[PDB]
Amino acid sequence: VDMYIERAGDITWEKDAEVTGNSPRLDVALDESGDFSLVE
Amino acid sequence: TTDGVYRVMTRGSTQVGVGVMQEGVFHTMWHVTKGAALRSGEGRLDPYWGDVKQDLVSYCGPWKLDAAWDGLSEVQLLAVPPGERAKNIQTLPGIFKTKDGDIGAVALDYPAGTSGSPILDKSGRVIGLYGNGVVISYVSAITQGKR
């Protein structure tokens, strides 16, 4: 199984970028397997 | 070895994720590669550090990325979706409130092969990687390592 990498770009901030998405505040727990879950 | 954002591909060829090369170290999320060695041209990249709970892995040396969300400012996801050129998506993070502190999160839902894409602050510093999260719609933690 050949896993391989190819360059896609520089890491840069772009002034002209699309803007979207909300900003939810969420209580979560992180278990030993690295999985996040919601908490109430 | 050039600094930049890279696709992680497997063999037809499929994009399984994304990573950040910086200071000669390749950074991605553990669940993307599971710790496998990576081919880079005629060269080989071997795993150096990894942690399943943080869902992070570095190749050729220790984790180098150390910037953090300031908690007030918009950030950009530098998404590299399969079959599309890298693109910047600006957003104001929400918050994962946990018992060991708060973590920035972005309510952006891109294809699974985008996992490992960097999230940037205004100076272009990588404040973490996209693709470990929860569903409320998907919300990704801004996952950062320790340098």
> How many domains does chain B divide into?
2
Q: Is residue B67 part of a domain?
A: no
Q: Is residue B18 part of a domain?
A: yes
Q: Which of B90, B79, B78 minimizes the C-alpha distance to A15?
A: B90
Q: By residue range, what is the domain housing residue B16? A: 4-59
- Residue of A1, A13, A19 to mutate, interface with B, max B Cβ within 10 Å: A13
Residues B91 and B38 in one domain: no
Instruction: Name B135's Cβ contacts closer than 8 Å, sequence gap at least 6.
Output: none
Residues B48 and B80 in one domain: no
Residues B79 and B127 in one domain: yes
Q: Is residue B84 part of a domain?
A: yes
Q: Which two tokens stand for residue B98?
A: 């946990």
Residue type at A31 in one-letter notation:
D
Dihedral sign computed on CA atoms, order B122, B128, B129, B131: negative
Length of chain A: 40
B8 vs B11: CA distance, rounded Å: 11
Q: Is residue B79 part of a domain?
A: yes
Asked which of B59, B87, B105 is the last residue of a domain, the reply is B59
Asked which of B35, B59, B83 is the last residue of a domain, the reply is B59
Element spanning B31, H or E: helix B30-33
Q: Which of A2, A18, A28 is closest, CB to CB, to B90?
A: A18
Method: X-ray
Q: Which of B136, B78, B146, B140 minimizes the C-alpha distance to B108?
A: B140
Active site residue B55: yes
- Residue of B7, B88, B89 to mutate, interface with A, max A Cβ within 10 Å: B88
